[PDB]
């Protein structure tokens, strides 16, 4: 699912860049002709807005973490058996060591 | 005969081939959204070929 969102964001960005290039070409043409104070075509403007709205949808989905506020829920599954052992104090005196010693 | 000059004026040049081509390609009288999109695609293809 994240890969699809990333690809969609990339495609939208590419479409936005293409719309920018089209608008640049339109203004370059406009500078050629005297007067003619007209606006850019509405179709490419709508394409620009479509590319802007699509890229803002995946930009929120890509980073969604929203962790739980309460601090009791993560330790709701953890068992006291694992907590009983600690990594500081480890005594290396067990029957498994002499049982696994030959093999 | 270029010594005594009475009146003088300066005029510009007609146009450039690529510039004229772009100006003609932009020229639209009455078209739908599909038409403008097709024209833009054709212009993009021409630019890619160039």
From Swiss-Prot, chain A:
GO terms for molecular function: cobalt ion transmembrane transporter activity; ferrous iron transmembrane transporter activity; inorganic cation transmembrane transporter activity; magnesium ion transmembrane transporter activity. Residues 22-42 are lumenal. GO terms for biological process: copper ion transport; magnesium ion transport; protein insertion into ER membrane by stop-transfer membrane-anchor sequence; tail-anchored membrane protein insertion into ER membrane. One of its GO terms (cellular component) is EMC complex. It is a multi-pass membrane protein. Residues 1-2, 63-103 are cytoplasmic. The keyword Phosphoprotein applies. Disulfide bonds: none annotated. Keywords: Endoplasmic reticulum, Endosome, Golgi apparatus, Magnesium, Membrane, Phosphoprotein, Transmembrane, Transmembrane helix, Transport. It comes from the Eukaryota. Belongs to the membrane magnesium transporter (TC 1.A.67) family. This is ER membrane protein complex subunit 5. The chain holds residues 2 to 104 of 131 of the full protein.
From Swiss-Prot, chain B:
It is found in: Endoplasmic reticulum membrane. Changing residue 24 to R: In CAVIPMR; uncertain significance. It comes from the Eukaryota. Component of the ER membrane protein complex (EMC). It is linked to Cerebellar atrophy, visual impairment, and psychomotor retardation: An autosomal recessive, neurodegenerative disorder characterized by developmental delay, intellectual disability, hypotonia, scoliosis, cerebellar atrophy, and variable dysmorphic features. Belongs to the EMC1 family. Part of the endoplasmic reticulum membrane protein complex (EMC) that enables the energy-independent insertion into endoplasmic reticulum membranes of newly synthesized membrane proteins. Preferentially accommodates proteins with transmembrane domains that are weakly hydrophobic or contain destabilizing features such as charged and aromatic residues. Involved in the cotranslational insertion of multi-pass membrane proteins in which stop-transfer membrane-anchor sequences become ER membrane spanning helices. This is ER membrane protein complex subunit 1. It comes from Homo sapiens (Human). The lineage of its organism: Eukaryota, Metazoa, Chordata, Craniata, Vertebrata. The chain holds residues 448 to 497 of 993 of the full protein.
């Amino acid at each position: 699912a994240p890969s699809l969102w990333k690809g969609l964001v990339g495609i939208g960005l590419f479409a936005l860049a293409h719309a920018a290039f089209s608008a640049a070409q339109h203004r370059s043409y406009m500078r050629l002709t005297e007067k003619e104070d007209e606006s850019l075509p509405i179709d490419i403007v709508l394409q620009t807005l479509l590319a802007f709205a699509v890229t803002c949808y995946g930009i929120v989905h890509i980073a969604g973490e929203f962790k739980d506020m309460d601090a009791t829920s993560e330790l709701k599954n953890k068992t006291f058996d694992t907590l009983r052992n600690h990594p500081s104090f480890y005594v290396f005196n067990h029957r498994g060591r002499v049982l696994f010693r030959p093999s | 005969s270029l010594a005594e000059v009475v009146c003088l004026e300066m005029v510009d040049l007609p146009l450039t081939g690529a510039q004229a081509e772009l100006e003609g390609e932009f020229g639209k009288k009455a078209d739908g959204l599909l038409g403008m999109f097709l024209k833009r695609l054709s212009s993009q293809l021409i630019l890619l070929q160039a």
